[PDB]
Amino acid sequence: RVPNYEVSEKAFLLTQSKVSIEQRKEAAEFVLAKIKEEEMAPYYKYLCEEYDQELYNELCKKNESKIKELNEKIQKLEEDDEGELEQAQAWINLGEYYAQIGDKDNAEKTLGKSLSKAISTGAKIDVMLTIARLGFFYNDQLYVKEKLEAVNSMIEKGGDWERRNRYKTYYGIHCLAVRNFKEAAKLLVDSLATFTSIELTSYESIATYASVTGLFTLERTDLKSKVIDSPELLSLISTTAALQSISSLTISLYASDYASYFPYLLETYANVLIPCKYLNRHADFFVREMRRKVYAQLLESYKTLSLKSMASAFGVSVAFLDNDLGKFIPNKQLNCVIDRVNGIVETNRPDNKNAQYHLLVKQGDGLLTKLQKYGAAVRLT
Template identity: 50%
Template sequence: MTSVPDLSLAQDIFVLRTPTLPRALQEESQKRLITAIEKGNKAPLYYYLHTSLDLPQIPWDEEKYKAMSAKISDDVKALEKTIAEAEQAGGEMEIAEGWVKVGELWADAGDKDKATFTLRKAYDLTPGLGSKIDILFTIIRIGIFFDDKAAVGRELENVKVLIDRGGDWDRRNRLKTYDGVYSLSIRKFSEAADLLLDSLSTFTSTELCTYEEVVQYAMLAAGVALGRVPLKTKVIDSPEVLSLLSSTPSIEPLATMTNSLYLCDYASFFKALVEVDESHLKVNRYLAPHAKYYVKEMRRRGYSQLLESYRALSLKSMAEAFGVSVEFLDNDLSKFIPQKKINCVIDRVNGIIETNRPDNKNAQYQLFIKQGDVLLTRLQKYGTAVRMSGSERVA
């Protein structure tokens, strides 16, 4: 599996387009991006950054652009010559492979339209199911690079159809990772958690992200999506997570966040959540659009977990548990209560939080009554139909 386009460059572009990120981070991304463009003759990407994104950190040089464009043109002509020779020799496989190489060249250079068009041509010429799936994976990565979520979603569905027709073990596992990262990017955290956690032990999709990154994505998705018990078994005690703790410092805030939530150490949980927001959410192109939602949802989860153990609790005690002021807690809870995302009421006169969780037995009783009403209605309709049928026979 080829690794074009280079998705790390898409992350660098995101960093340069986010002025609130640290200057040192922006300088690193600027240097990497300029070096990659010059060494890889990425003229289309260079033009895209100048015209579509107008990135001031990437200075425009017309002569440099023309030189890189000429080099790409020569490379494409050389590949097309090889394809023409294969056409004369009648080599169908060689023809398809030739167009794949042309498509990958355009993908690497950063020309979305030419790359996609050429790869679709190669797809139509390719006889093998596995090779067709690989081409679609490349088209998906192009969509990911240019943040075309609609295209990524469509192509993932096409891959699923081919996989169901006979995709091999490796490509099935790759699909889990691709689908998991896509789900993460569109805020489907539950689906992302299941897919990414399931892909850890068989991960091979290094063209999409590193193993360390996919572990972090899995931990983030699981943190907000899984219940307390599965969070313990699938994340906290996960061999894949534990094996990286000592060698990957970036995972430490995530581990602290999930562990402290499980252990009900809410002050540590809130501190870790702030660090996760700064070190993982705001700086990542997939997660940044959902950072505020994620932090808010994790706070809600922490509040709900603590309140499950009480019928009433003082605002002061709860604020101390989370390491925040009473004013902050009062204001934050007030965002969730009207939407019924936290089942409690605040007695500000007495400084008390009272839980009002729905009674499970009462809920079951109401469900039983509702189902009984539905059954009775169906029986009445059936009885009416039987009587009408009998009347017709008598007549």
């Protein structure tokens, strides 16, 4: 169960040359041991491209041995009786080897056979989870997506809470993996209550990831409570450096300590965002998005501020602040201007009946267009 997810999570780090060259070569040790032990040989060939014949001779041997054993065993099983349960169990076991070697193709054949045959509802759900897990190993979004739909057909028939925890978290990784964080936060905070490590990245990872998503999604009170008043995160302390950085960030956002906000922002980038396979792609949007949320927050409470004041609080020069503010303003989240010659920062205040007016017409505009498009269509008939 454990090697299935661990091989891929560890190997990622080595791949990256984003990381320091020194860090990159330490990862190499761990990854290398598990290539040979688990015989990852077809896939390994792929993976050497991206950065002893014995491994592979071993593969041929192991393969042949294992094959030969189980072959005539399954040929004997056919002569013999029970095809529902016992042959299905063996067919699962062929797939287990296939999943060991990194061919997604060959596991999917055998494990389908099990489903075909009439089995326990509990048993059904199980088998479909494993098929979808094979997608994570490579990290493909399209394959994962389609498999997890089926799982929901059987999920309430079995009605187990045991495997629905596994289901919640699988869909979580699919979401994390893509840019959208809204969905992830909702499943991954829940996994704090109940986690199962089975074919799933360890609980400590889930603690860190839950916290990142947390920040991005919930508004003040709610979000704060979810990412702080959680008993679980306090009990777990700061046991690894990465979980520390993110929590430090959370403290500073909430506490409105804006001097330490910026140091904490930089740490989270180096040690949270990049180790993460999922948020590697999304590093760019994430870190930038935080500078905007935090700035908005300070401005909300202030009619006006000075540039010199604002600048000082964060720990950047006055010039730097201005430049970085001029990015945020037309995009619009800050809702602000800078009256430059005076050096004051004004915050436009249309929060009222005017606000509600403007929003409401735009939403009306959206309904108006759809009606036309549909109208015109039917009208031709």
